[PDB]
Amino acid sequence: PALRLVDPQIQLAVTRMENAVGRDNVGPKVYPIILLSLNMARKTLNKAFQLTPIAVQMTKLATTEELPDEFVVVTV
Amino acid sequence: PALRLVDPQIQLAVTRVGPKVYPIILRLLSLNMARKTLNSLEDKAFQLTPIAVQMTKLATTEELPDEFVVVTVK
């Protein structure tokens, strides 16, 4: 009931073990995201985790022409 | 509420340049791979494929990697 394209700066890397010796060989690939908060994290002190938020800009879609040939849907 | 280590086979690629990938962790849904594939003679339809999202409950915080991302649902 709600659709929008996540800015290409953020894409999902996907892998499937089940189709290694099975297929042929799907690899690890990055795919755009179609649709909360997110934070990128790092180690600082002895156990401490710094994090900074990354702003996810999205573009609302209207035409199916905007939809690429390979992407990933994520529902909320 | 505990955090969830997301399947490392599923990792987030951040470019914003330095394109690096990071594990995903969850604070508290579905996932659909979408390819064209469906040929036909005039127009190409879309093949959807749900992927199994296998999360594991995190034991100790020492298990966390030095670089990762956290996503919040509600």
PDB file of C-alpha atoms in Angstrom:
ATOM      1  CA  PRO A   1       0.000   0.000   0.000  1.00  0.00           C
ATOM      2  CA  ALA A   2       3.114   2.150  -0.155  1.00  0.00           C
ATOM      3  CA  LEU A   3       6.011   2.031  -2.652  1.00  0.00           C
ATOM      4  CA  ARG A   4       9.239   4.045  -2.961  1.00  0.00           C
ATOM      5  CA  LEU A   5      12.812   3.619  -4.238  1.00  0.00           C
ATOM      6  CA  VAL A   6      15.723   3.874  -1.817  1.00  0.00           C
ATOM      7  CA  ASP A   7      18.576   6.077  -3.000  1.00  0.00           C
ATOM      8  CA  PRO A   8      21.188   4.017  -4.905  1.00  0.00           C
ATOM      9  CA  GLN A   9      23.751   4.873  -2.232  1.00  0.00           C
ATOM     10  CA  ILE A  10      22.169   2.106  -0.120  1.00  0.00           C
ATOM     11  CA  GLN A  11      21.776  -1.308  -1.758  1.00  0.00           C
ATOM     12  CA  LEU A  12      21.390  -4.837  -0.388  1.00  0.00           C
ATOM     13  CA  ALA A  13      24.101  -7.465  -0.870  1.00  0.00           C
ATOM     14  CA  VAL A  14      22.573 -10.938  -1.163  1.00  0.00           C
ATOM     15  CA  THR A  15      23.935 -14.496  -1.288  1.00  0.00           C
ATOM     16  CA  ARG A  16      22.332 -17.935  -1.379  1.00  0.00           C
ATOM     17  CA  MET A  17      24.358 -20.976  -0.343  1.00  0.00           C
ATOM     18  CA  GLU A  18      21.603 -23.365  -1.452  1.00  0.00           C
ATOM     19  CA  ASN A  19      22.324 -22.525  -5.111  1.00  0.00           C
ATOM     20  CA  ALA A  20      26.119 -22.866  -5.263  1.00  0.00           C
ATOM     21  CA  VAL A  21      26.597 -26.520  -6.191  1.00  0.00           C
ATOM     22  CA  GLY A  22      22.875 -26.414  -7.012  1.00  0.00           C
ATOM     23  CA  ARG A  23      22.696 -23.733  -9.708  1.00  0.00           C
ATOM     24  CA  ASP A  24      25.058 -24.415 -12.624  1.00  0.00           C
ATOM     25  CA  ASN A  25      25.965 -20.291  -9.561  1.00  0.00           C
ATOM     26  CA  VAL A  26      24.228 -17.209  -8.138  1.00  0.00           C
ATOM     27  CA  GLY A  27      26.821 -14.879  -6.663  1.00  0.00           C
ATOM     28  CA  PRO A  28      26.873 -12.138  -4.052  1.00  0.00           C
ATOM     29  CA  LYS A  29      25.146  -9.231  -5.784  1.00  0.00           C
ATOM     30  CA  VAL A  30      23.986  -5.765  -4.741  1.00  0.00           C
ATOM     31  CA  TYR A  31      20.403  -4.799  -5.509  1.00  0.00           C
ATOM     32  CA  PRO A  32      18.421  -1.576  -5.097  1.00  0.00           C
ATOM     33  CA  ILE A  33      15.783  -1.451  -2.379  1.00  0.00           C
ATOM     34  CA  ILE A  34      12.057  -0.712  -2.675  1.00  0.00           C
ATOM     35  CA  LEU A  35       9.979  -0.163   0.456  1.00  0.00           C
ATOM     36  CA  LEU A  36      11.989   3.003  10.977  1.00  0.00           C
ATOM     37  CA  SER A  37      15.615   4.102  11.275  1.00  0.00           C
ATOM     38  CA  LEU A  38      19.139   2.878  10.627  1.00  0.00           C
ATOM     39  CA  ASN A  39      22.500   3.498  12.261  1.00  0.00           C
ATOM     40  CA  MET A  40      26.041   2.639  11.184  1.00  0.00           C
ATOM     41  CA  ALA A  41      28.191   1.359  14.043  1.00  0.00           C
ATOM     42  CA  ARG A  42      31.845   1.102  15.096  1.00  0.00           C
ATOM     43  CA  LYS A  43      33.994   0.087  18.089  1.00  0.00           C
ATOM     44  CA  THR A  44      35.541   2.775  20.304  1.00  0.00           C
ATOM     45  CA  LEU A  45      36.172   1.862  23.971  1.00  0.00           C
ATOM     46  CA  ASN A  46      36.719  -1.298  26.001  1.00  0.00           C
ATOM     47  CA  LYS A  47      32.402  -2.987  25.236  1.00  0.00           C
ATOM     48  CA  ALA A  48      31.446   0.301  23.582  1.00  0.00           C
ATOM     49  CA  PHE A  49      29.873   0.937  20.194  1.00  0.00           C
ATOM     50  CA  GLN A  50      29.674   4.343  18.589  1.00  0.00           C
ATOM     51  CA  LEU A  51      26.997   4.780  15.959  1.00  0.00           C
ATOM     52  CA  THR A  52      25.973   7.554  13.604  1.00  0.00           C
ATOM     53  CA  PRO A  53      22.677   7.660  11.673  1.00  0.00           C
ATOM     54  CA  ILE A  54      22.665   7.560   7.875  1.00  0.00           C
ATOM     55  CA  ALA A  55      19.862   9.548   6.242  1.00  0.00           C
ATOM     56  CA  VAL A  56      17.999   7.376   3.725  1.00  0.00           C
ATOM     57  CA  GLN A  57      16.594   9.544   0.939  1.00  0.00           C
ATOM     58  CA  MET A  58      13.876   7.866  -1.107  1.00  0.00           C
ATOM     59  CA  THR A  59      12.120   8.759  -4.346  1.00  0.00           C
ATOM     60  CA  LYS A  60       8.396   8.068  -4.546  1.00  0.00           C
ATOM     61  CA  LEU A  61       7.598   6.177  -7.740  1.00  0.00           C
ATOM     62  CA  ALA A  62       4.612   6.486 -10.055  1.00  0.00           C
ATOM     63  CA  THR A  63       5.626   4.938 -13.384  1.00  0.00           C
ATOM     64  CA  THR A  64       6.718   1.321 -13.730  1.00  0.00           C
ATOM     65  CA  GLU A  65       9.436   2.645 -16.065  1.00  0.00           C
ATOM     66  CA  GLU A  66      11.350   3.675 -12.922  1.00  0.00           C
ATOM     67  CA  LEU A  67      11.523   0.031 -11.812  1.00  0.00           C
ATOM     68  CA  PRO A  68      14.873  -1.600 -12.729  1.00  0.00           C
ATOM     69  CA  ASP A  69      15.198  -5.122 -14.052  1.00  0.00           C
ATOM     70  CA  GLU A  70      16.646  -6.479 -10.784  1.00  0.00           C
ATOM     71  CA  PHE A  71      15.740  -5.063  -7.371  1.00  0.00           C
ATOM     72  CA  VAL A  72      14.602  -6.145  -3.907  1.00  0.00           C
ATOM     73  CA  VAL A  73      11.273  -5.475  -2.190  1.00  0.00           C
ATOM     74  CA  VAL A  74      11.143  -4.911   1.573  1.00  0.00           C
ATOM     75  CA  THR A  75       7.776  -4.759   3.348  1.00  0.00           C
ATOM     76  CA  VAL A  76       6.986  -3.202   6.718  1.00  0.00           C
TER      77      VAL A  76
ATOM     78  CA  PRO B   1      14.113  -7.066  23.895  1.00  0.00           C
ATOM     79  CA  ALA B   2      17.296  -8.459  22.325  1.00  0.00           C
ATOM     80  CA  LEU B   3      19.106  -7.790  19.068  1.00  0.00           C
ATOM     81  CA  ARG B   4      19.116 -10.140  16.082  1.00  0.00           C
ATOM     82  CA  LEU B   5      22.159 -11.008  14.003  1.00  0.00           C
ATOM     83  CA  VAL B   6      20.830 -11.033  10.451  1.00  0.00           C
ATOM     84  CA  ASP B   7      22.037 -13.725   8.065  1.00  0.00           C
ATOM     85  CA  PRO B   8      25.497 -12.606   6.880  1.00  0.00           C
ATOM     86  CA  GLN B   9      24.520 -13.871   3.435  1.00  0.00           C
ATOM     87  CA  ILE B  10      22.270 -10.789   3.589  1.00  0.00           C
ATOM     88  CA  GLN B  11      24.445  -7.703   4.109  1.00  0.00           C
ATOM     89  CA  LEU B  12      24.013  -3.991   3.443  1.00  0.00           C
ATOM     90  CA  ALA B  13      26.179  -2.242   0.830  1.00  0.00           C
ATOM     91  CA  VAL B  14      26.786   1.422   1.712  1.00  0.00           C
ATOM     92  CA  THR B  15      28.579   3.631  -0.815  1.00  0.00           C
ATOM     93  CA  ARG B  16      28.048   7.016   0.779  1.00  0.00           C
ATOM     94  CA  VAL B  17      33.236   7.131  -2.079  1.00  0.00           C
ATOM     95  CA  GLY B  18      34.222   3.732  -0.700  1.00  0.00           C
ATOM     96  CA  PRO B  19      31.624   1.042  -1.417  1.00  0.00           C
ATOM     97  CA  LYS B  20      31.692  -1.157   1.699  1.00  0.00           C
ATOM     98  CA  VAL B  21      29.349  -3.894   2.944  1.00  0.00           C
ATOM     99  CA  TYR B  22      28.271  -4.324   6.566  1.00  0.00           C
ATOM    100  CA  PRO B  23      26.444  -6.978   8.590  1.00  0.00           C
ATOM    101  CA  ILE B  24      22.881  -6.173   9.633  1.00  0.00           C
ATOM    102  CA  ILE B  25      21.515  -6.232  13.183  1.00  0.00           C
ATOM    103  CA  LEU B  26      17.920  -5.759  14.263  1.00  0.00           C
ATOM    104  CA  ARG B  27      16.233  -3.785  17.039  1.00  0.00           C
ATOM    105  CA  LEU B  28      12.503  -4.374  17.512  1.00  0.00           C
ATOM    106  CA  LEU B  29       8.290  -8.073   7.502  1.00  0.00           C
ATOM    107  CA  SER B  30       9.376  -9.887   4.351  1.00  0.00           C
ATOM    108  CA  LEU B  31      12.005  -9.814   1.613  1.00  0.00           C
ATOM    109  CA  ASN B  32      11.400 -10.310  -2.111  1.00  0.00           C
ATOM    110  CA  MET B  33      14.013 -10.706  -4.836  1.00  0.00           C
ATOM    111  CA  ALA B  34      12.526  -9.277  -8.037  1.00  0.00           C
ATOM    112  CA  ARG B  35      13.896 -10.064 -11.499  1.00  0.00           C
ATOM    113  CA  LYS B  36      12.376  -9.622 -14.959  1.00  0.00           C
ATOM    114  CA  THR B  37      12.770 -13.166 -16.322  1.00  0.00           C
ATOM    115  CA  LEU B  38       9.137 -13.517 -17.421  1.00  0.00           C
ATOM    116  CA  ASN B  39       9.669 -13.007 -21.146  1.00  0.00           C
ATOM    117  CA  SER B  40       6.503 -13.242 -23.275  1.00  0.00           C
ATOM    118  CA  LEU B  41       6.263 -11.752 -26.769  1.00  0.00           C
ATOM    119  CA  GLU B  42       5.229  -8.127 -26.095  1.00  0.00           C
ATOM    120  CA  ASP B  43       6.014  -7.285 -22.456  1.00  0.00           C
ATOM    121  CA  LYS B  44       8.182  -8.709 -19.682  1.00  0.00           C
ATOM    122  CA  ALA B  45       6.562  -9.428 -16.322  1.00  0.00           C
ATOM    123  CA  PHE B  46       8.272  -9.704 -12.918  1.00  0.00           C
ATOM    124  CA  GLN B  47       9.418 -12.824 -11.077  1.00  0.00           C
ATOM    125  CA  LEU B  48       9.276 -12.466  -7.288  1.00  0.00           C
ATOM    126  CA  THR B  49      11.182 -14.772  -4.947  1.00  0.00           C
ATOM    127  CA  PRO B  50      10.981 -14.531  -1.148  1.00  0.00           C
ATOM    128  CA  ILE B  51      14.341 -15.201   0.502  1.00  0.00           C
ATOM    129  CA  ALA B  52      14.608 -16.883   3.898  1.00  0.00           C
ATOM    130  CA  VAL B  53      15.706 -14.250   6.432  1.00  0.00           C
ATOM    131  CA  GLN B  54      17.470 -16.273   9.135  1.00  0.00           C
ATOM    132  CA  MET B  55      18.209 -14.191  12.228  1.00  0.00           C
ATOM    133  CA  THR B  56      19.910 -15.543  15.340  1.00  0.00           C
ATOM    134  CA  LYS B  57      19.583 -14.081  18.820  1.00  0.00           C
ATOM    135  CA  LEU B  58      22.823 -12.442  19.923  1.00  0.00           C
ATOM    136  CA  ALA B  59      24.504 -13.938  22.978  1.00  0.00           C
ATOM    137  CA  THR B  60      27.273 -11.577  24.131  1.00  0.00           C
ATOM    138  CA  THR B  61      28.127  -8.128  22.792  1.00  0.00           C
ATOM    139  CA  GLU B  62      31.725  -9.277  22.292  1.00  0.00           C
ATOM    140  CA  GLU B  63      30.340 -11.207  19.311  1.00  0.00           C
ATOM    141  CA  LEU B  64      29.467  -7.992  17.482  1.00  0.00           C
ATOM    142  CA  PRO B  65      31.823  -7.015  14.660  1.00  0.00           C
ATOM    143  CA  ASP B  66      33.745  -3.755  14.686  1.00  0.00           C
ATOM    144  CA  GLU B  67      31.656  -2.502  11.744  1.00  0.00           C
ATOM    145  CA  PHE B  68      27.963  -3.153  11.114  1.00  0.00           C
ATOM    146  CA  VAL B  69      24.603  -1.426  10.770  1.00  0.00           C
ATOM    147  CA  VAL B  70      21.520  -1.581  13.001  1.00  0.00           C
ATOM    148  CA  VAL B  71      17.945  -1.281  11.739  1.00  0.00           C
ATOM    149  CA  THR B  72      14.915  -0.488  13.903  1.00  0.00           C
ATOM    150  CA  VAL B  73      11.315  -1.595  13.370  1.00  0.00           C
ATOM    151  CA  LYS B  74       9.039   0.332  15.748  1.00  0.00           C
TER     152      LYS B  74
END
